[PDB]
């Protein structure tokens, strides 16, 4: 194999802005480079082939250039939908993909909207008890969640999940779920979800009493 | 119009093999090389190899060469990828793609696991308090204990799209769990119905869960 060194591996830029990705081959590849866009839930979409030729329907704000072993790719007038991961490809015959560049849209900071949910009566009937906390539409993506049962931190039984960046409002969301047996859920009463985000030194606290 | 139509999702036990097909139409199949590409979250996009359909000559990524075999059925315009001795690291979406990389199949999801196909349990997420007399209300439903991926979640059969977040599934044991949220005006719920529709094609299950206030 050859090496296709794609750089940088991560991009963060503003709407209407411009970004540029470098792809450096370990030897001359004679302009047989292509650039792809990969969005979640979609297959790879070839934007540019043969260094600089756009594919049908691709707008001119996508551009590519280079020669020998140094190649570049640029997106101007960034749109929220441009979020995704971009790859160079040496496609002449033996293929080599670059490592990929993940593109983030920069935007104003936003505190998360935090919601906590008791276990449903339907789940408790089955012997289980999941406490769900949503932390929706925040920016930037860095965030930490703490669970407290009767004012005591809890780490076992917690599952976290983070969305990709929203293609519309450029925010992030995450879910934190504490799953217990029904027996363990009933011997405690106060369940607290605490979100710590850059937007405030003070955490956002949501909780409920099991006995309503 | 070039089309590459791949076979459906595959659930394979560890150590077993899988064979994926890719039916080409709209061009001379024996004329263009067929490539295969692996897409995973842990390894991004990896080339598997290519085949010249005319003579069957193949080239492989050295990482796959000992376990992957590319073949073609010339008379039926179909290309195959045979992958032996799979492990969980081989769970990924596999694409066939025609040279020069402009036409792609829709992809075949391969899950390598010993878990059995299992329908989800769907639980409502209603707030544990009364809504303020004029506020925005966040609801949801918990989709727990299904296999394999994926499930689809909509709200009111797609009529509620505002403020919807369906989070990526996480493995809770041998089974997947996710939640989906939706935010609606307090004037809309509970005076109007809010229902999350959960679909799990692998088990032919379609569940509607109406979200009702707690007490
Ligand atoms: Na350029």
Residue numbers in the entry:
A (entry chain L): 1 to 94, 96 to 213
B (entry chain H): 1 to 52, 52A, 53 to 82, 82A, 82B, 82C, 83 to 97, 101 to 214
Paper text:
The serpinopathies are among a diverse set of conformational diseases that involve the aberrant self-association of proteins into ordered aggregates. α1-Antitrypsin deficiency is the archetypal serpinopathy and results from the formation and deposition of mutant forms of α1-antitrypsin as “polymer” chains in liver tissue. The misfolding of proteins and their spontaneous ordered aggregation underlie the pathology of Alzheimer’s, Huntington’s, and Parkinson’s diseases; amyloidoses; and serpinopathies—the latter involving self-association of mutant members of the serine protease inhibitor (serpin) superfamily. α1-Antitrypsin is a 52-kDa serpin expressed and secreted predominantly by hepatocytes and is the most abundant circulating protease inhibitor. However, genetic variants such as the severe Z (E342K) allele of α1-antitrypsin promote proteasomal degradation and the formation of ordered linear polymers. We have isolated polymers from the liver tissue of Z α1-antitrypsin homozygotes (E342K) who have undergone transplantation, labeled them using a Fab fragment, and performed single-particle analysis of negative-stain electron micrographs.
As the foundation of this analysis, an atomic model of the Fab-antigen complex was required. Protein crystallization trials of Fab4B12 were successful and yielded a 1.9 Å structure, with the crystallographic parameters summarized in table S1. The asymmetric unit contained two molecules, one of which exhibited fully defined variable loop regions. Despite extensive efforts, it was not possible to obtain a crystal structure of the α1-antitrypsin–Fab4B12 complex; SAXS data were collected instead. One thousand randomized starting orientations for α1-antitrypsin and Fab4B12 were subjected to rigid-body energy optimization with reference to these constraints and the Mon60,90 subunit map and scored according to both the cross-correlation coefficient (CCC) with the density and their correspondence with the SAXS profile (middle). Backbone and side-chain flexibility was conferred on regions of the Fab likely to contribute to the interface (heavy chain: 27 to 33, 51 to 57, 71 to 76, and 94 to 102; light chain: 27 to 32, 49 to 54, 66 to 70, and 91 to 94) and α1-antitrypsin side chains within the boundaries of the epitope. The five models that maximized these metrics showed an unambiguous polarity (right). One model was selected that best represented this cluster by root mean square distance comparison with the others. This showed the heavy-light chain partition to be oriented off-center along helix A, with the variable-constant domain axis perpendicular to the long axis of the serpin [Fig. 4, A (right) and B (left)]. The cleft between the variable and constant domains of Fab4B12 aligned closely with a central “dimple” exhibited by the monomer density (denoted by an asterisk in the figure), and the complex corresponded well with the experimentally determined SAXS profile (right).
